[PDB]
From a paper:
The parasite adhesin P. vivax Reticulocyte Binding Protein 2b (PvRBP2b) binds to Transferrin Receptor 1 (TfR1) and Transferrin (Tf) on the surface of reticulocytes, which is critical for red cell invasion. PvRBP2b interacts with TfR1 through its C-terminal domain (residues 461–633) with a buried surface area of ~1271 Å2, and with Tf through its N-terminal domain (residues 168–460) with a buried surface area of ~386 Å211. Here, we isolate and characterize anti-PvRBP2b human monoclonal antibodies from two individuals in Cambodia with natural P. vivax infection. To further elucidate how human mAbs recognized PvRBP2b, we structurally characterized several antibody Fab fragments in complex with PvRBP2b169–470. We were able to determine eight crystal structures of PvRBP2b169–470 with antibody Fabs with resolutions ranging from 2.45 to 3.45 Å—PvRBP2b-241242 (3.15 Å), PvRBP2b-258259 (3.05 Å), PvRBP2b-273264 (2.55 Å), PvRBP2b-253245 (3.45 Å), PvRBP2b-237235 (2.45 Å), PvRBP2b-243244 (3.35 Å), PvRBP2b-251249 (2.90 Å) and PvRBP2b-283284 (3.15 Å).
241242, 258259, and 273264 form interactions with PvRBP2b169–470 at helices α5 and α6, and 241242 forms additional interactions with part of the N-terminal loop between residues S181–N185. These antibodies bind epitopes that partially overlap with the TfR1 binding site at helix α5 (green highlight). Although 241242 belongs to a different clonal group, it has similar CDR loop conformations to 258259 and 273264. Superimposing the crystal structures of PvRBP2b-241242, PvRBP2b-253245, PvRBP2b-258259, and PvRBP2b-273264 onto the PvRBP2b-TfR1–Tf cryo-EM ternary complex reveals that these antibodies cause steric hindrance with TfR1–Tf. The ability of these antibodies to directly interfere with TfR1–Tf binding is consistent with these antibodies showing inhibition in all interaction assays. Crystal structures of PvRBP2b-241242, PvRBP2b-253245, PvRBP2b-258259, and PvRBP2b-273264 show that these antibodies bind to the PvRBP2b-TfR1 interaction interface, and therefore inhibit through steric hindrance with TfR1. 241242, 273264, 258259, and 253245 competed with each other and were inhibitory in the reticulocyte-binding, FRET, and IP assays. The first set of antibodies includes 241242 or 273264 which binds the N-terminal domain (S168–E460), resulting in steric hindrance with TfR1 and shows association rates of ~3.26 ×105. Of the four sets of antibodies that may be useful in combination, structural analyses reveal two field polymorphisms that may affect 241242/273264 binding. 241242/273264 binds in the N-terminal domain where seven polymorphic residues occur and the crystal structures reveal their binding may be affected by K363 and G382 polymorphisms.
Author numbering:
A (entry chain A): 170 to 464
B (entry chain C): 7 to 217
C (entry chain B): 6 to 143, 148 to 230
């Protein structure tokens, strides 16, 4: 087959706080903003946020899709090298070596990942400014030492039902069996490498395994991030149940479940995309394995 | 999974070294070899049966078929003296398994017999309700000695604190062995003897409880 | 070049806890999988635990699952190893090593570190007990000086205030089951003058600030 889509690449900033994604909304923080509009509706003391989510959040959403779109020219050059290294027919037409072509892939791949971060650096400062507005909006609450946690605990019940609509049990079994076939495919092609005079086809399988290795790690990251949100929120429903907290403790409560649930939905969108990529690249390996003898 | 490695291999400088690593159906697994110099960082010499990373000379070679894999060093030098380890991954429980280790000793000097010096307990230690026998081993090569203690021709295993051979400045090794005895055990015998065995040769010293 | 720098190892009491750290120089920390391998005294390389490049998966050994815990920090680019309950079986040198695979561990080691020593013993600072080792009631006589029950290393031993330096052989110390060390220093001397010549060993211990001068003399009785 052929790698028709390369939406599995991503990039994080130097602080590793913000994770860029090619899929919308490109930020797990935007899902947190979508969830705070739900928090502000239950509070009759916060009414200015409806206009913030309608302008400041939509501007950050569109600027994110725009900043990702600028790297489309760089994305196609990286994708083009992926299709050359994995297809022996396309590689046999070009004149450069495989070591040179593989090093170009590693250089261009980081150029695309570096583009997504650098073009979104202005948006990274925009996310921080919206968080300070939310923290300032919570300060305007009338409660000081008597802030009710009913809205905070009612949201935990809503989240746990939404967590059940997640095939976490199916993803863990899938990734554990996919790796067993992966390392078996690794050890297999190296044993075969020394017994077959077919350098291009073997190298194409090696390169796909390098691509698969990157996607398996991105799959395990989001899969472990979905689990942490499910387990930590569950721990909140089985912990203390304070009737009234301080306004400072209330801000931390909304930012806790708000950040937990946003990472959950952000990982669910990525795990779906990363699942199709793992299946697709596994098909490309077997199509290359069947092409080992001839054609 | 269990990998079996010969504990020691001797090579003369210029010859070819062959370190073996064994296991059941080894020919179906990927094996990587590591060189480890004491005090230094281990080095991946051969990985995936036969491949060598950059910076590794062609003297190092790797094979794998059937039940054993062999690491081969063509023109061994004194600088290749280190203990080597084979490594395979156990796909069942998913973790790394190493071999027992193989000390590679390059014979750069003739064999040297050890020098045993046995000491009785000092009269000051006996006055302090204690007693210790000191068996000092020096100037032997290669560094592999086995110490056994006798109490009037009777084997002793309690109170023995033997140390590891240490390379001296002349590339020769030294060792020590201390026997801790209560003053009653020391006096209630006719002779204590330290027995040092090196390369199949045993050197015996003896001390009498009298005086 | 590519190198990994361990730090944090040292002395822990049985049951204590240690946080081992590992810095990286020569490559991007986020893109590679890392692992820990330890080597017990007199034993071979013992694999401890490995981790994915992003922390998605972590792998452990059976004799390790209880206490050790892998930790990663892709922001500060630091790799950790937390030891919950230390036992006597855990005394070893721990090597920070990285997996040669792409992001997910291929389970073969690419680079290694110099290692970090971790010692598990209740031993505390203690001065030594110096005892003279008389000759065998003897051409050449061999008298010595016994330094026993001290912690930690090292102990400096000279002879005749540094006058006798040839023929002396200060032996490497032994590590007893009591966690304390003991060495021996023996000098080759003439046998016809051992009763009339002065042979004195002076022991110095930096930790305990113990300075002992012991005179060696035969016991012909």
């Amino acid at each position: 087959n052929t790698t028709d889509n390369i939406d599995y690449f991503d990039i994080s900033d130097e602080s590793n706080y913000y994770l860029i994604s090619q899929l919308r909304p490109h930020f797990s923080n935007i899902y947190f903003f979508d969830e705070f509009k739900r928090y502000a509706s239950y509070h009759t003391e916060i009414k200015r946020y409806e206009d913030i989510h309608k302008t400041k959040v939509n501007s950050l959403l569109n600027e994110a899709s725009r900043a990702i779109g600028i790297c489309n020219r760089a994305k196609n050059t990286v994708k083009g090298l992926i299709n050359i290294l994995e297809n022996p027919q396309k590689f046999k037409t070009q004149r450069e070596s495989y070591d040179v072509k593989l090093r170009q892939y590693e250089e261009k791949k980081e150029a695309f990942r570096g583009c997504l971060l650098n073009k979104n650096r202005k948006n990274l400062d925009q996310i921080k400014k919206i968080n300070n507005e939310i923290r300032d909006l919570l300060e305007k609450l009338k409660c000081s030492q008597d802030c009710q946690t009913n809205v905070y605990f009612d949201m935990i019940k809503i989240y746990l039902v939404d967590f059940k609509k997640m095939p976490y049990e199916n993803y863990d079994t899938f990734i554990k069996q996919y790796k067993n076939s992966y390392l078996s495919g690794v050890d297999m092609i190296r044993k075969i490498e020394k017994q077959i005079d077919n350098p291009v086809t073997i190298n194409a399988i090696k390169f796909t395994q390098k691509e698969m290795g990157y996607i398996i790690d991105r799959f395990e990251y989001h899969l472990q991030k979905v689990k942490h949100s499910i387990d930590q929120v569950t721990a909140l429903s089985d912990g203390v149940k304070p009737k009234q907290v301080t306004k400072n403790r209330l801000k931390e409560y909304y930012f806790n479940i708000g950040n937990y649930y946003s990472i959950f939905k952000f990982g669910k969108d990525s795990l779906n995309m990363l699942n199709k990529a793992l299946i697709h690249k596994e098909k490309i390996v077997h199509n290359l394995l069947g092409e080992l003898f001839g054609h | 999974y269990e990998l079996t490695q010969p504990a020691s291999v001797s090579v003369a400088p210029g010859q070819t070294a062959q370190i073996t690593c064994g296991g059941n159906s080894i020919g179906r697994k990927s094996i990587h070899w590591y060189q480890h110099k004491p005090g230094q960082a281990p080095v991946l010499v051969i990985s995936y049966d036969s491949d060598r990373p950059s910076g590794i000379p062609e003297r190092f070679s790797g094979s794998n078929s059937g039940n054993t894999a062999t690491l081969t060093i063509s023109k061994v030098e004194a600088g290749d003296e280190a203990d080597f380890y084979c490594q395979v991954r156990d796909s069942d429980n998913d973790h790394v398994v190493f071999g027992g280790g193989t000390k590679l000793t390059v014979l750069g000097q003739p064999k040297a017999a050890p020098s045993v010096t046995l000491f009785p307990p000092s009269s000051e230690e006996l006055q302090a309700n204690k007693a210790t026998l000191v068996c000092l081993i020096s100037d032997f090569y290669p560094g592999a000695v086995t110490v056994a203690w006798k109490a009037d021709s009777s084997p002793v295993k309690a109170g023995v604190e033997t140390t590891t051979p240490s390379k001296q400045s002349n590339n020769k090794y030294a060792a020590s062995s201390y026997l801790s005895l209560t003053p009653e055990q020391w006096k209630s015998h006719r002779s204590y003897s330290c027995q040092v065995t090196h390369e199949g040769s045993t050197v015996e010293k003896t001390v009498a409880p009298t005086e | 070049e590519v190198q990994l720098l361990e730090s944090g190892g040292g002395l822990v009491q049985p049951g204590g806890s240690l946080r081992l750290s590992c810095a990286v120089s020569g490559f991007t920390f986020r893109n590679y999988a890392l692992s820990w391998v330890r080597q017990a005294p007199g034993k071979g390389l013992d694999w401890v635990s490995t981790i994915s490049a992003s922390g998605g998966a972590t792998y452990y050994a059976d004799s390790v699952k209880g206490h050790f815990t892998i930790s990663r920090d892709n922001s500060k680019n630091i790799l950790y190893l937390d030891m919950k309950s230390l036992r006597a079986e855990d005394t070893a040198i721990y090597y920070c090593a990285r997996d040669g695979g792409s992001y997910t561990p291929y389970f073969f080691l690419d680079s290694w570190g110099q290692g970090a020593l971790v010692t598990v013993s209740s031993a505390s600072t203690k001065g030594p007990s110096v005892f003279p080792l008389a000759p065998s009631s003897k051409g050449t006589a061999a008298l010595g000086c016994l330094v026993k029950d001290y912690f930690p290393e090292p102990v400096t031993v000279s002879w005749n205030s540094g006058a006798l330096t040839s023929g002396v052989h200060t032996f490497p110390a032994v590590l007893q089951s009591s966690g304390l060390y003991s060495l021996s220093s023996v000098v080759t001397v003439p046998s016809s003058s051992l009763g009339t010549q002065t042979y004195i060993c002076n022991v110095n211990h930096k930790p305990s600030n113990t300075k002992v001068d012991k005179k060696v003399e035969p016991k012909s009785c």
